[PDB]
Design an enzyme around this catalytic site. Structure first.
Site, mmCIF file in Angstrom:
data_model
loop_
_atom_site.group_PDB
_atom_site.id
_atom_site.type_symbol
_atom_site.label_atom_id
_atom_site.label_comp_id
_atom_site.label_asym_id
_atom_site.label_seq_id
_atom_site.Cartn_x
_atom_site.Cartn_y
_atom_site.Cartn_z
ATOM 1 C CG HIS A 196 -0.290 0.159 2.524
ATOM 2 N ND1 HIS A 196 0.132 1.377 3.028
ATOM 3 C CD2 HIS A 196 0.027 -0.766 3.461
ATOM 4 C CE1 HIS A 196 0.684 1.189 4.214
ATOM 5 N NE2 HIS A 196 0.627 -0.098 4.505
ATOM 6 C CB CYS A 214 1.967 -3.221 5.480
ATOM 7 S SG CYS A 214 0.369 -3.797 6.106
#
Length: 266
Positions: A196, A214
């Site tokens: 992301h 992440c």
């Protein structure tokens, strides 16, 4: 068609993924998820007929009592057509629970898209049919909250999503906790790993790991990933100080060795 009697208290409905008519990447398993726990897994498997063209061997493995997966030993060959016949109408699935209906779906395999996130270089490299089409600096999980190594299947994508630590039981007020707006998030594990946009770590991307797990990339690169990578494409993480993604994560199917997968667990 033969009628089957039913009771709303003793029915389970199957839900098949991927969607009917979809083009998916070379890592996409067939998934049949029931809305109840399945006591008789062998009965469920016997009722599910998967046919492939070109034909390839594959097998069922249950991630949990609700969901069975089917895949070949190696990533699908691009262009393969897959037909899924879930013929569960009236099937005794154990403990008085019966299949509520049949479901019937077809899908096709697209291009081979494999993105490798190498922690030794801090670079996420996207290859399409073997050739590098994109190189993205990345910042993965810090040493205390590292990104697990392994093969991840690309799942859902979000133009915007909220990351809230309270869904993991960590209060946002905690040192420790977080409530973050995130753009251009591609899911790669059920446990919560996404690729992301992370403008706040752009200086660390390509240099230092700063995330909770992440794969942080630039806003532009995250939007590129959102636009160009599809459900079933593959992200492989290598060389982190983490362990290996669990094979039963939801998107970690390819980390289970083939002899264990093929032997199954029905």
């Amino acid at each position: 068609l033969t009628f089957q009697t039913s009771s709303p208290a003793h029915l389970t409905m199957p839900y098949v993924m991927p969607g009917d008519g979809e083009v998916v990447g070379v890592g996409e398993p067939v998934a049949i998820r029931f809305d109840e726990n399945i006591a008789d897994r062998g009965a469920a498997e016997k009722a599910i007929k998967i046919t492939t063209n070109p034909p390839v061997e594959g097998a069922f493995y249950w991630l949990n009592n609700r969901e069975v997966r089917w895949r070949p030993e190696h990533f699908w060959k691009p262009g393969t057509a897959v037909d899924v016949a879930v013929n569960t109408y009236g099937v005794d699935l154990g403990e008085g629970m019966f299949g509520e209906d049949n479901v019937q779906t077809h899908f096709t395999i697209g291009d081979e898209v494999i993105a490798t996130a190498d922690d030794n270089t801090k670079i996420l490299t996207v290859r399409v049919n073997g050739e590098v089409v994109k190189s993205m600096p990345t910042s993965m999980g810090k040493d205390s909250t590292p990104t697990a190594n392994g093969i991840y299947i690309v799942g859902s994508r979000y133009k915007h999503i909220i990351m809230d630590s309270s869904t993991y039981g960590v209060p946002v007020n905690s040192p420790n906790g977080y409530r973050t707006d995130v753009d251009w998030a591609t899911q790669i594990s059920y446990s919560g790993v996404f690729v992301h946009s992370a403008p706040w770590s752009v200086g660390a991307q390509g240099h230092t790991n700063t995330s909770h797990g992440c794969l942080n990339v630039s806003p532009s690169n995250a939007q590129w990933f959102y636009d160009h990578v599809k459900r079933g494409d593959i992200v492989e993480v290598v060389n982190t100080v983490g362990g290996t993604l669990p094979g039963i994560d939801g998107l970690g199917d390819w980390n289970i060795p083939w002899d264990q997968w093929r032997a199954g667990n029905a």
